[PDB]
Amino acid sequence: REIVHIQAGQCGNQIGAKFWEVISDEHGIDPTGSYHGDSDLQLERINVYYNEATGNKYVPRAILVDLEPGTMDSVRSGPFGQIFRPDNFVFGQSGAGNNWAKGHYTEGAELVDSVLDVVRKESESCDCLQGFQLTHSLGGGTGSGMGTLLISKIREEYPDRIMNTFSVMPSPKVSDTVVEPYNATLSVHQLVENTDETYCIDNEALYDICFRTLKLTTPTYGDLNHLVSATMSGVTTCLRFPGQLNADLRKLAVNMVPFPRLHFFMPGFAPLTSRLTVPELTQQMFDSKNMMAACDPRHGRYLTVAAIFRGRMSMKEVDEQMLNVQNKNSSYFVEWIPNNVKTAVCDIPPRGLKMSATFIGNSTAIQELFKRISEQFTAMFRRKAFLHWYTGEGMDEMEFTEAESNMNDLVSEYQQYQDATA
Amino acid sequence: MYTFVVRDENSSVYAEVSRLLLATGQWKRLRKDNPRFNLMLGERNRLPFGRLGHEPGLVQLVNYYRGADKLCRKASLVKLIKTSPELSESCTWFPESYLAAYNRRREGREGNVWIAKSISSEASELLDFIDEVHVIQKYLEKPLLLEPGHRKFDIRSWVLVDHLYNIYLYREGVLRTSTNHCIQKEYEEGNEMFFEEFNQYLMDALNTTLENSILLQIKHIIRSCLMCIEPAISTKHLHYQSFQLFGFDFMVDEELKVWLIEVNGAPACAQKLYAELCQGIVDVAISSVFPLADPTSIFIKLH
Amino acid sequence: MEVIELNKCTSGQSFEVILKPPSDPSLEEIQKKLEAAEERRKYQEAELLKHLAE
Amino acid sequence: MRECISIHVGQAGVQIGNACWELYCLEHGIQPDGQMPSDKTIGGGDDSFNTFFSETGAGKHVPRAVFVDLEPTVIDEVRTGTYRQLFHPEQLITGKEDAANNYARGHYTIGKEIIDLVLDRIRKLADQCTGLQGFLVFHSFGGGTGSGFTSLLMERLSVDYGKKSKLEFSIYPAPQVSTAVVEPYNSILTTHTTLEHSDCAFMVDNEAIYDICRRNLDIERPTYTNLNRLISQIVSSITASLRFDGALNVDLTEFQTNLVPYPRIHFPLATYAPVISAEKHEQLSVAEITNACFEPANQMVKCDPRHGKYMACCLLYRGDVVPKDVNAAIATIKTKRSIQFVDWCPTGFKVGINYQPPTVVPGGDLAKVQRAVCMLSNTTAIAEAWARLDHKFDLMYAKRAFVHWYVGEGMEEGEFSEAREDMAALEKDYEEVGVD
Numbered sequence A: 001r002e003i004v005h006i007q008a009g010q011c012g013n014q015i016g017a018k019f020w021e022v023i024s025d026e027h028g029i030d031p032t033g034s035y036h037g038d039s040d041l042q043l044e045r046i047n048v049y050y051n052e053a054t055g056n057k058y059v060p061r062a063i064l065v066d067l068e069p070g071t072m073d074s075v076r077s078g079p080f081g082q083i084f085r086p087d088n089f090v091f092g093q094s095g096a097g098n099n100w101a102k103g104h105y106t107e108g109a110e111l112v113d114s115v116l117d118v119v120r121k122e123s124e125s126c127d128c129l130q131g132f133q134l135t136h137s138l139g140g141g142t143g144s145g146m147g148t149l150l151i152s153k154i155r156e157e158y159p160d161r162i163m164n165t166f167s168v169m170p171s172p173k174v175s176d177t178v179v180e181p182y183n184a185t186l187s188v189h190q191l192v193e194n195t196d197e198t199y200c201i202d203n204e205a206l207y208d209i210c211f212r213t214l215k216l217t218t219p220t221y222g223d224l225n226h227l228v229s230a231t232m233s234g235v236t237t238c239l240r241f242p243g244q245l246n247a248d249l250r251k252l253a254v255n256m257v258p259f260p261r262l263h264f265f266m267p268g269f270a271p272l273t274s275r276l277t278v279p280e281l282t283q284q285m286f287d288s289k290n291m292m293a294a295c296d297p298r299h300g301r302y303l304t305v306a307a308i309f310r311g312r313m314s315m316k317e318v319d320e321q322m323l324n325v326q327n328k329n330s331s332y333f334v335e336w337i338p339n340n341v342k343t344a345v346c347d348i349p350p351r352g353l354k355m356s357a358t359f360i361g362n363s364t365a366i367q368e369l370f371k372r373i374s375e376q377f378t379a380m381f382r383r384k385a386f387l388h389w390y391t392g393e394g395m396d397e398m399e400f401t402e403a404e405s406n407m408n409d410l411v412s413e414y415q416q417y418q419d420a421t422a
Numbered sequence B: 001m002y003t004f005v006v007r008d009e010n011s012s013v014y015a016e017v018s019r020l021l022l023a024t025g026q027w028k029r030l031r032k033d034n035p036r037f038n039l040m041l042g043e044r045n046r047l048p049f050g051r052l053g054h055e056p057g058l059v060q061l062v063n064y065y066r067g068a069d070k071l072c073r074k075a076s077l078v079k080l081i082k083t084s085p086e087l088s089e090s091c092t093w094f095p096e097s098y099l100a101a102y103n104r105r106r107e108g109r110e111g112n113v114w115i116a117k118s119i120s121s122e123a124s125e126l127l128d129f130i131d132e133v134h135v136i137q138k139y140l141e142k143p144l145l146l147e148p149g150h151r152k153f154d155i156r157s158w159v160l161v162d163h164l165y166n167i168y169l170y171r172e173g174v175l176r177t178s179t180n181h182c183i184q185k186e187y188e189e190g191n192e193m194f195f196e197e198f199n200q201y202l203m204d205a206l207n208t209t210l211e212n213s214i215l216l217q218i219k220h221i222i223r224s225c226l227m228c229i230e231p232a233i234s235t236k237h238l239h240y241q242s243f244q245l246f247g248f249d250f251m252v253d254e255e256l257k258v259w260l261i262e263v264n265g266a267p268a269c270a271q272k273l274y275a276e277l278c279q280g281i282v283d284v285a286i287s288s289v290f291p292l293a294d295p296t297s298i299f300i301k302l303h
Numbered sequence C: 001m002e003v004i005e006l007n008k009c010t011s012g013q014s015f016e017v018i019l020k021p022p023s024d025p026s027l028e029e030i031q032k033k034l035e036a037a038e039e040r041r042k043y044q045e046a047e048l049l050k051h052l053a054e
Numbered sequence D: 001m002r003e004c005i006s007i008h009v010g011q012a013g014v015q016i017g018n019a020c021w022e023l024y025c026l027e028h029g030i031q032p033d034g035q036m037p038s039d040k041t042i043g044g045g046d047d048s049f050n051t052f053f054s055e056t057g058a059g060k061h062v063p064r065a066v067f068v069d070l071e072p073t074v075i076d077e078v079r080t081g082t083y084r085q086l087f088h089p090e091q092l093i094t095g096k097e098d099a100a101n102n103y104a105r106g107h108y109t110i111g112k113e114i115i116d117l118v119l120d121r122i123r124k125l126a127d128q129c130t131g132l133q134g135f136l137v138f139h140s141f142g143g144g145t146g147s148g149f150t151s152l153l154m155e156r157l158s159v160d161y162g163k164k165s166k167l168e169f170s171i172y173p174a175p176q177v178s179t180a181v182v183e184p185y186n187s188i189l190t191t192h193t194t195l196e197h198s199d200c201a202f203m204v205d206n207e208a209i210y211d212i213c214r215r216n217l218d219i220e221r222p223t224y225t226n227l228n229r230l231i232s233q234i235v236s237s238i239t240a241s242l243r244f245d246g247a248l249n250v251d252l253t254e255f256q257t258n259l260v261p262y263p264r265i266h267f268p269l270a271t272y273a274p275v276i277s278a279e280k281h282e283q284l285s286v287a288e289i290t291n292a293c294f295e296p297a298n299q300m301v302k303c304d305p306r307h308g309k310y311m312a313c314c315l316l317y318r319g320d321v322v323p324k325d326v327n328a329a330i331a332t333i334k335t336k337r338s339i340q341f342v343d344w345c346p347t348g349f350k351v352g353i354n355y356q357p358p359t360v361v362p363g364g365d366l367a368k369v370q371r372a373v374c375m376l377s378n379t380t381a382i383a384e385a386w387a388r389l390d391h392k393f394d395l396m397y398a399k400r401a402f403v404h405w406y407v408g409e410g411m412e413e414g415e416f417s418e419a420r421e422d423m424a425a426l427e428k429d430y431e432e433v434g435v436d
């Protein structure tokens, strides 16, 4: 039933804030928490993401976390800022200096119990907690380091619940600091072990889409985030509205995750076009140029796939188009998981669109993204470059070595299953 | 585009059919075990018919009829003819097959050679040969002989049955002459005489023609055998569809009566005909079900 | 084509027509199964918590 | 009069159950408030319909049913729906969190928690019975509840009611409407554990039902509501003999006697005709609807009986039918169709006629017909469905895909192989009785 949402660090709170703006709209909840929609579909499964207060107010079951008050002051000022439970803002002053170790071991260690207190209070009001979703980047310090610390601690206290993340991967094309590969590699290590599902959001990919497709000369974090929140709306549609397929976090995981470590998903959205038939959606959503992870699916194989169409359209035409892409490109789907492409339809489209499709792929191509971060990590680590920022926080080199090793292992695991035949 | 899989790498005929489908640029050959296929060119034995026609959105077609073995097994065929009222215990064009007959025939001097496989005049001689399942059928004894040579032969005809159960007789047949080309290879021919020439001989030596003296009977026999098992094997309203290529083997006696020897469910072809037949297969059996983008038939439709 | 056992009620009838003559665990063991599976879950949960404590 | 208790497990079992009871009510003139005007002995009696409905002193007619699901969404609909007054709250049982399409989770983890409550509720229905026949159990193969909880229940039902008959109505997984990739695992697992406990199981392949709904009701994209209304007709035909005066299949133990010579080979093929779009007719005759019982396109499971052997065959007509017309229909069919029985059984047909035509839901997708038939035939051809399923199982299991989810819930990996080997033996059994 209920999901508990956490957002951590600058990136995490920025996409987190947009996500609530978007879905709050779809569910007809204005910034005061009041409902004003013209349908029951909106309020039928609203309890998955919103608590109910008196006056029929709806309050996001969301927890905002940062080691620095900057971004959370910005969110409290933003459009929907007043909607969040003010008690659910949890923040330090020191910041994390884009340093995983500070978020995970020092600055973050000091703040984490305050967060878990709010996490707990929110879980105790839940009729039947599904699990948690966290939004964050892997390239910084708070979202990356403290975010994964939160996840481990959450798992210790709720070991039989589902842990789901939206993780923004760093790219040189859109980079804040040189140590992003370090922070990301350290974080992936945690994710491989402690999440059930991770939507890999590649900033490289978001940029290429804003630039080459949307024809935006100067993509901004605002643009990048519009894509992300639209994707986030799409991938959670099944959890928020009436539906048979992947209707909750555990059923999604059972359908999408054949092997416990291989739970990194390549999302996609359509339409995306610069300044609309069911075939059009279907071709675009499967198009490499539409993937929010910078990987070529034609370089790997799909283990499993979920597709969510939204709006009024022909179910018959949906089924047809899907079965075509699938039966026409059947080489890219593994033969040893029969019928591994599942489709859902929801009648309510996102704001401003007649219809849209969201794609969620578990492709072995994803190894490209990890191999990329591993190459960047290794270029520096050979020379122990910039290590002092981390050893100065108590970390040892050996811990970097293990993270590297484990991520390299994950990559080898994806290759194994890319070569497997019936 | 269309997709197919190949599960009999030994089939001479369909090896050529796959070659043409590919050379159409509208057919993709998928891997042996990819189930998302339009067309299966199946394995000669233990074809998994049970798994056909259950792939949503795919029209599936296969190049064998389930149950057609009832015609293509020596022993099965005999049972079928004997016990099937429209073929009947007493059928004109099939040699008695399986003692009471051995008596009658060796009651008078008139008789009495029988061949057996899975030839002799003494029963016990090969009846012991067996034990040391088979069928015993009268060895025509009075074959029609070719001159020059004074030699025996047999006729092979190729029949394509499509998904609608239309019965198509390939206009080209061959005579295997002196009988198997495997035994013999171990006359301006190559031990293979075709219709152009054999019709001429018939006109020359017997003042008759191929159509009249022999082909009529062949058509009748083919139409009779296949109409008989139609209700058992037809895929008319089935969740998948079948077509299949058969080879019928005939013997002609000296009175120009045609005799059915057997039917093969997996026939080869005359080297020189592979081109024409195989193209016909893709035309009538495959392209009929899976049409392409944007004659003079080589087949005689039997009805 | 012998027709036998023809029974007639006010709501219909039934009969048989012939064409040709004829040519486990205890409550105990279940409970053990479920309890053994339960212990296995507990062991796995204990290994995880131990790992998390490290 | 011996009672029958129905048990609906999981979404599919519950939703099909819903449609069946709706139909039963319509067929007997029971209103949703529970009153039955045509019924004259207020608060009791031993009429035929009483095998499915008990009665209160107020004249309410109450299904002898239990609804069970590990999550409350589907059952909540029963609680608030058209027929909410029919059911006593103790008959509807829900957990908080479902089996997540995981047999192990439904069977071991969550099943253990809720089994005793379910058995208590069933006992409460049993104690109200003067002479219980046994149970009819509706569930999917693919769902974690339908597969896993159902098999635990069936084992426990054998313990508490060893002398009782147990019949299944089982939904066999079809990708067309499938909500999970692991449904083949759940199917083999549940079949392995339930085999020794079920006396007769009627499989309904969603693929078959789907296609009949598209082809004959001109429905472009069938919903569960379309599927279930058709399925309910088939079930109603099968259970009619228990709920109406008749002489064929009049108690549960007779379903086995007439259809199941070999205990393990207990899956009869169901074939139904005519299915006619209500959105359009020329009424089919006895000959025709009977001939249609041999067309694969009308079967609950798509397979080819021509390439198998029959062990038994019942014909169940509803409406305007007399024996004369049936025998004549058969004669003609015997000579135009391929119908080979196992040579150690008589080549025949047990035939049941009920003069009341099928009933249809007002404003449904089915047209009223004057006569219909459902053929139950125990043929070896249905093993095709086992072979397809076992094949999909082998593809995933060879790489252990998804296996961690089941081990994770406390099941041993070894149970996968026991289950698969039992199905291999089951395919072997069909092979022998059916192949020359």
Ligand SMILES: Nc1nc2c(ncn2[C@@H]2O[C@H](COP(=O)(O)OP(=O)(O)OP(=O)(O)O)[C@@H](O)[C@H]2O)c(=O)[nH]1
Residues within 6 Å of the ligand: D009, D010, D011, D012, D013, D015, D016, D069, D070, D098, D099, D100, D101, D102, D106, D139, D140, D141, D142, D143, D144, D145, D146, D147, D171, D172, D173, D174, D177, D178, D179, D180, D183, D206, D224, D225, D227, D228, D231
């Ligand atoms: N015919 C029909 N099939 C259904 C229906 N509901 C679900 N199914 C099928 O049943 C399978 C899914 O299993 P469910 O019954 O929904 O799962 P469950 O028993 O509730 O178990 P959980 O996993 O815990 O929810 C799939 O093959 C569905 O297509 C229904 O109402 N009618």
Ligand SMILES: Nc1ncnc2c1ncn2[C@@H]1O[C@H](COP(=O)(O)OP(=O)(O)CP(=O)(O)O)[C@@H](O)[C@H]1O
Residues within 6 Å of the ligand: B095, B115, B117, B137, B138, B139, B140, B141, B153, B154, B176, B179, B180, B249, B251, B261, B262, B264
């Ligand atoms: N009853 C018979 N009378 C005369 N000749 C016969 C005969 N039965 C078989 N033959 C001869 O033996 C040859 C092959 O026999 P047969 O067809 O029965 O076995 P076969 O199956 O080895 C090869 P194929 O299957 O390609 O025909 C024929 O060409 C024919 O000349």
Ligand SMILES: Nc1nc2c(ncn2[C@@H]2O[C@H](COP(=O)(O)OP(=O)(O)O)[C@@H](O)[C@H]2O)c(=O)[nH]1
Residues within 6 Å of the ligand: A008, A009, A010, A011, A012, A014, A015, A096, A097, A098, A099, A137, A138, A139, A140, A141, A142, A143, A144, A168, A169, A170, A171, A174, A175, A176, A180, A203, A206, A221, A224, A225, A228
């Ligand atoms: N897509 C996106 N990426 C961001 C945003 N803000 C920061 N990033 C990325 O996140 C990383 C920096 O982490 P950040 O969230 O700012 O640090 P933190 O506060 O310590 O967690 C870099 O990889 C940035 O490219 C944002 O709003 N959107």
Ligand SMILES: [Ca+2]
Residues within 6 Å of the ligand: A094, A110
């Ligand atoms: Ca401090």
Ligand SMILES: [Ca+2]
Residues within 6 Å of the ligand: D039, D040, D041, D042, D043, D044, D045, D055
């Ligand atoms: Ca009464």
Ligand SMILES: [Ca+2]
Residues within 6 Å of the ligand: C024, D158, D162, D196, D197
């Ligand atoms: Ca028993």
Ligand SMILES: [Cl-]
Residues within 6 Å of the ligand: D160, D161, D162, D163, D164
């Ligand atoms: Cl008992």
Ligand SMILES: [Mg+2]
Residues within 6 Å of the ligand: A010, A011, A140, A176
């Ligand atoms: Mg920053």
Ligand SMILES: [Mg+2]
Residues within 6 Å of the ligand: B154, B180, B249, B261
């Ligand atoms: Mg020959």
Ligand SMILES: [Mg+2]
Residues within 6 Å of the ligand: B072, B074, B262, B263, B264
């Ligand atoms: Mg042969």
Ligand SMILES: [Mg+2]
Residues within 6 Å of the ligand: D010, D011, D012, D143
């Ligand atoms: Mg369900």
